[PDB]
Write a protein that binds this ligand. Structure first.
Ligand SMILES: [Mg+2]
Ligand SMILES: [Mg+2]
Ligand SMILES: [Mg+2]
Ligand SMILES: [Mg+2]
Ligand SMILES: [Mg+2]
Ligand SMILES: [Mg+2]
Ligand SMILES: [Mg+2]
Ligand SMILES: [Mg+2]
Ligand SMILES: [Mg+2]
Ligand SMILES: [Mg+2]
Ligand SMILES: [Mg+2]
Ligand SMILES: [Mg+2]
Ligand SMILES: [Mg+2]
Ligand SMILES: [Mg+2]
Ligand SMILES: [Mg+2]
Ligand SMILES: [Mg+2]
Ligand SMILES: [Mg+2]
Ligand SMILES: [Mg+2]
Ligand SMILES: [Mg+2]
Ligand SMILES: [Mg+2]
Ligand SMILES: [Mg+2]
Ligand SMILES: [Mg+2]
Ligand SMILES: [Mg+2]
Ligand SMILES: [Mg+2]
Ligand SMILES: [Mg+2]
Ligand SMILES: [Mg+2]
Ligand SMILES: [Mg+2]
Ligand SMILES: [Mg+2]
Ligand SMILES: [Mg+2]
Ligand SMILES: [Mg+2]
Ligand SMILES: [Mg+2]
Ligand SMILES: [Mg+2]
Ligand SMILES: [Mg+2]
Lengths: 155, 117
RNA sequence: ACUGCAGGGGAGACUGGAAUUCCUGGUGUAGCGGUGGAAUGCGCAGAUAUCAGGAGGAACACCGGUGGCGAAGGCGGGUCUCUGGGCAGUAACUGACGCUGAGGAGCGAAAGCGUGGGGAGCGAACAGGAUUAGAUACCCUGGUAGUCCACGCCGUAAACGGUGGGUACUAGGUGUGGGUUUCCUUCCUUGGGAUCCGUGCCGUAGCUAACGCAUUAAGUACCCCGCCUGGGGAGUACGGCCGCAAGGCUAAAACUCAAAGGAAUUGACGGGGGCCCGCACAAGCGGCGGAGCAUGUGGAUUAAUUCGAUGCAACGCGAAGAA
């Protein structure tokens, strides 16, 4: 706001999988306070993910995120009589946030039956670099690589 | 097929555009690739990014004719005046001397009327 | 009058360099130009760019300032010729010859006008493009008169210090331009003191409605000229004089209004400025606006649809109970 930064909230380690990345994924799936429902999707989709690779799924999850982290985003600004996008650097804890919104966000409009198998396909199609969440990485970058001329207006 | 080892790079940088031509010391033009040759159109040509690609395109096209060392003669009140010189160093050239040949009239001809924007 | 001194004061003739544009060649290839963003335009028939030569016009970077000069308008690239004024000192000379000045006469930025030259750039009118409800404008590409020179006319400007000219007097403090002169004088310091004429800044007495002026008066006084008498009508009509014309100078009345004004004060306001805050925006999450239905309102209808609420701050409000 006006008065500087606000203290960000801590995340406890997930009890089944010893990593903070899984408990940050269950909060993007979470709707309407149904957290035990959102934990039966993320625990369910990771167990479905190890039955098609055999690799441990939190190692599969981090390679799914390293292919959808943006390095440059395209924040907008009005200058004169024409407004145009400005490429800025993405800080690391936003790159985790903006990627997990894209796995959950493009899995809700994917063509399968249950959310457990829609999410488990998008993680596996991003660990290989083929999904639709991966395509938004090289659409955010292409809009940020077509606007290097405007990098001198950094607010 | 022209071959010359020592050259002279001229840079003109206005409020609308930049042009980087590269000549021999006798004054004959070798390569001239500017900010419209590198793909831009409109107000984007005046940006400092469009000057560090115009200077790269004239540098590699001059090194094919054997240019290894240039002299820099900038002129014009532009913002792509410093980024074009640093762009020539990261293309395999040596800058040597940097001069300033901006034309300064001795109160000669009359300037146009001032803009009431 | 004599001796010194400072200066963009004026006039004429000759003349110097940078830059803009064009022309003629050399190299070179697809863009250049332009704006808040574009487009008209230029170019691919060799443009912009880069180098060399040539033609022409206009203005004079640095010195240049808070500064000089002139009655004001105004005045600066250099040189020669001709020429006006000012200041200080000497106190040689004339012996009130002084000041102002109705009418009058001369000078008088810029625009404009006449005849003839010149025309690089800039640029009214003009045209096209964009902006917009429209855009006869702002912004952009072009571009004619004119701006320049010679000889005449015009005679107006916020021609201003919005302050007529001469003189005498009335605390000072502190810069800067032109002189002359005394003290440590050769301690050189080109510092200090005295005096004369410019030019600014701040300040006391005094004046002023206030702001402010204040030894360069808007103070205290005397001599002469111009001018004012509520605001519009109006610096207009008619008459006259000047002018080639555009127009200038002198200058009214009927009628109409009860005001038009000058400085300062408090506030509100700004597409003025500084700093600061709010779910204001940004970063997020979930909605409304579409559908059926419930409830309130506008409208319409009705014998009656009781009345009240009507930007935020009325519309699941008075109504926490209308068969
Ligand atoms: Mg002179
Ligand atoms: Mg010349
Ligand atoms: Mg020409
Ligand atoms: Mg040529
Ligand atoms: Mg040329
Ligand atoms: Mg002269
Ligand atoms: Mg006698
Ligand atoms: Mg007189
Ligand atoms: Mg004239
Ligand atoms: Mg005419
Ligand atoms: Mg004429
Ligand atoms: Mg003529
Ligand atoms: Mg037009
Ligand atoms: Mg114009
Ligand atoms: Mg003459
Ligand atoms: Mg006359
Ligand atoms: Mg008058
Ligand atoms: Mg004047
Ligand atoms: Mg007057
Ligand atoms: Mg007087
Ligand atoms: Mg006199
Ligand atoms: Mg004095
Ligand atoms: Mg004062
Ligand atoms: Mg008075
Ligand atoms: Mg009257
Ligand atoms: Mg008249
Ligand atoms: Mg008449
Ligand atoms: Mg007032
Ligand atoms: Mg304000
Ligand atoms: Mg928002
Ligand atoms: Mg609805
Ligand atoms: Mg009612
Ligand atoms: Mg309510």
């Amino acid at each position: 706001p006006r008065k500087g930064p606000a203290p960000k909230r801590p995340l406890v380690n997930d009890p089944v999988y010893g990593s903070q990345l899984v408990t940050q994924l269950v909060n993007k799936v979470l709707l309407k306070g149904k957290k035990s429902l959102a934990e039966r999707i993320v625990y369910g989709a990771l167990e479905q993910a190890r039955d098609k690779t055999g690799t441990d799924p939190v190692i599969t999850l981090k390679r799914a995120l390293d292919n959808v982290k943006p390095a440059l985003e395209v924040r907008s600004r009005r200058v004169g009589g024409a407004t145009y996008q400005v490429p800025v650097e993405v800080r690391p804890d936003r790159s985790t946030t903006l990627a997990l919104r894209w796995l959950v966000g493009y899995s809700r409009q994917r063509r399968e039956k249950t959310m457990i198998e829609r999410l488990a396909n998008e993680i596996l199609d991003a660990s290989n670099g083929l999904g639709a969440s991966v395509k938004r990485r090289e659409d955010t970058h292409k809009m940020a690589e077509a606007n290097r001329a405007f990098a001198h207006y950094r607010w | 097929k022209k071959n010359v080892p020592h050259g002279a790079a001229h840079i003109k940088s206005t409020f609308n555009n930049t042009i980087v031509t590269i000549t021999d010391p006798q004054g004959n033009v070798i390569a001239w690739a500017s900010s419209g040759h590198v793909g831009f159109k409109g107000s984007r040509k005046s940006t400092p990014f469009a000057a560090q690609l115009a200077a790269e395109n004239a540098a590699r096209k001059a090194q094919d004719h054997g240019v290894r060392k240039v002299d820099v003669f900038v002129k014009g009140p532009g913002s792509g005046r410093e980024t074009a010189i640093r762009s020539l160093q990261a293309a395999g050239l040596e800058v040597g001397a940097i001069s300033d040949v901006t034309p300064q009239p001795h109160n000669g001809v009359r300037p146009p009327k001032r803009r009431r924007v």
